[PDB]
Curated annotation (Swiss-Prot), chain A:
Source domain of life: Bacteria
Subunit structure, interactors included: The RNAP catalytic core consists of 2 alpha, 1 beta, 1 beta' and 1 omega subunit. When a sigma factor is associated with the core the holoenzyme is formed, which can initiate transcription.
Taxonomic classification: Bacteria, Thermotogati, Deinococcota, Deinococci, Thermales
Role according to the record: DNA-dependent RNA polymerase catalyzes the transcription of DNA into RNA using the four ribonucleoside triphosphates as substrates.
Protein known as: DNA-directed RNA polymerase subunit beta
Family: Belongs to the RNA polymerase beta chain family.
Disulfide-bond pairs as recorded: none
């Protein structure tokens, strides 16, 4: 507790006492490039 | 649990065991690149081995152990001359032909083109010239004259 630092005992983590669910919303797309449409596929050609 | 098939090595160093349909099947057995490396297996190799049901998150049964490769024990796989390295020669073992339902055809073929082992032969005919029926006769005749020869059609 230096300037406005807060010191917490462990119990509030042992108890389900401060938590929330964070939701992440990713997104992608396939395009049809004049070089060739970008297939959404499972293939990683090279190695693994 | 036992499985069998023909080895098809993927680009990633692992392979699958296939059935007669010669394609990807749901029942193909995974073969790790490891087993391939120890047993020096190669594409088209016939592998028989005890397998297990695939684990959770596994889609294909896995070959726990290799028992026989090409109907023989795996050891010979490590030490054998590669097929590409085999010395080619002329067909030195004639295969004489006969099929009971048409011995005319087989005997004429023998009088026209005797067949040996290692033969690179061809029958040339327009459409509807018996080429298919002739091939049928040859299949039947080989399955009577040379049962020892693995007859693949
Ligand atoms: N040795 C034979 N005896 C009787 N019929 C034959 C014989 N060879 C060919 N044929 C007839 O010719 C047709 C074409 O023969 P096939 O070789 O099977 O087809 P294709 O030569 O067009 O591939 C068949 O319908 C068959 O009845
Ligand atoms: Mg035909």
């Amino acid at each position: 507790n230096f300037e406005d630092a807060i010191v917490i005992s462990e119990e509030l983590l042992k108890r389900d006492f401060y938590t929330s669910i964070h939701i992440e919303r990713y997104e992608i797309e396939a395009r049809d490039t004049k070089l060739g449409p970008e297939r959404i596929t499972r293939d990683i050609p090279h190695l693994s | 649990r036992l499985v069998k098939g023909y080895l098809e090595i993927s680009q990633d160093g692992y392979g699958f065991l296939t059935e007669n349909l010669h394609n990807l099947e749901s029942r193909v057995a995974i073969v790790s690149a490891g087993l391939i490396k120890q047993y020096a297996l190669r594409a088209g190799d016939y592998v028989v081995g005890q397998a297990r049901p695939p684990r959770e998150n596994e889609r294909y049964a896995t070959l726990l152990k290799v028992e026989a490769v090409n109907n023989l024990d795996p050891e010979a796989a490590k030490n054998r001359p590669r097929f590409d390295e085999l010395t080619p020669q002329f067909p030195d073992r004639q295969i004489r032909l006969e099929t009971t339902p048409d011995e005319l055809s087989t005997r004429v073929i023998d009088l026209l083109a005797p067949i040996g082992r290692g033969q690179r032969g061809l029958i040339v005919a327009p459409p509807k010239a018996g080429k298919t029926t002739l091939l049928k006769k040859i299949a039947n005749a080989v399955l009577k004259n040379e049962p020892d020869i693995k007859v693949i059609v």
